[PDB]
């Protein structure tokens, strides 16, 4: 069970999230919703997420990241929540 920090919380809520406390599974779900809805992934290599002009970029602190790098993604997410 985790508590998203304000910027991450704002992202999740922009795609339907209601609460303030989540499981990691839920956070990952809404993050996926967010990326898919704003179509941030590259068309030809769909593991590449471009976010340099998106709040997700500010949040993660990157211009882009690859979905293949699982540990990195978990790390970037963990930096932006408090483990309740």
């Amino acid at each position: 069970l985790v508590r998203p920090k304000p910027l991450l919380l704002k992202l999740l809520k922009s795609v339907g999230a209601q609460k303030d406390t989540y499981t990691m599974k839920e956070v990952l779900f809404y993050l996926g919703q967010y990326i898919m809805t704003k179509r941030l992934y590259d068309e030809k290599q769909q593991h590449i997420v471009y976010c340099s002009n998106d709040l997700l970029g500010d949040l993660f602190g990157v211009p882009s990241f690859s979905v293949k790098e699982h540990r990195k993604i978990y790390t970037m997410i963990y930096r932006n929540l408090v483990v309740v």
Binding site: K25, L28, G32, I35, M36, Y41, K44, Q46, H47, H70
Partner: protein, 100 residues
């Protein structure tokens, strides 16, 4: 070698015999030919770019088990959803089985 001409047909090889399938693809699009299933056969897949545009996928198969075998190849591009799903791995059960 076999090609798209041989799609949806049946061939007969001997156990241990090799055959080559050659299919055009263009991985610069993000698509590639991948093996979807391969009963009775072992296989290798290699892309060779057309040096003279895309290129050719070489799928070498070998009869590894006597009987009615089959290989299915798909020209596909992994979707974002498929990548993202792997961040939440499903529980798996694995059993090595030595058949005598």
């Amino acid at each position: 070698s076999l090609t798209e001409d041989n799609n949806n047909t049946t061939i007969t090889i001997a156990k241990g015999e090799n055959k080559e399938i050659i299919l055009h693809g263009n991985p610069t699009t993000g698509y590639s030919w991948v093996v979807d299933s391969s009963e009775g056969l072992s296989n290798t897949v290699e892309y060779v770019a057309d040096q003279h545009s895309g290129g050719k996928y070489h799928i070498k198969i070998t009869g590894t088990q006597t009987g009615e075998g089959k290989i299915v190849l798909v020209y596909r591009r992994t979707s974002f959803a498929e990548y993202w799903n792997l961040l939440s791995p499903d529980r798996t059960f694995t059993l090595k089985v030595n058949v005598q």
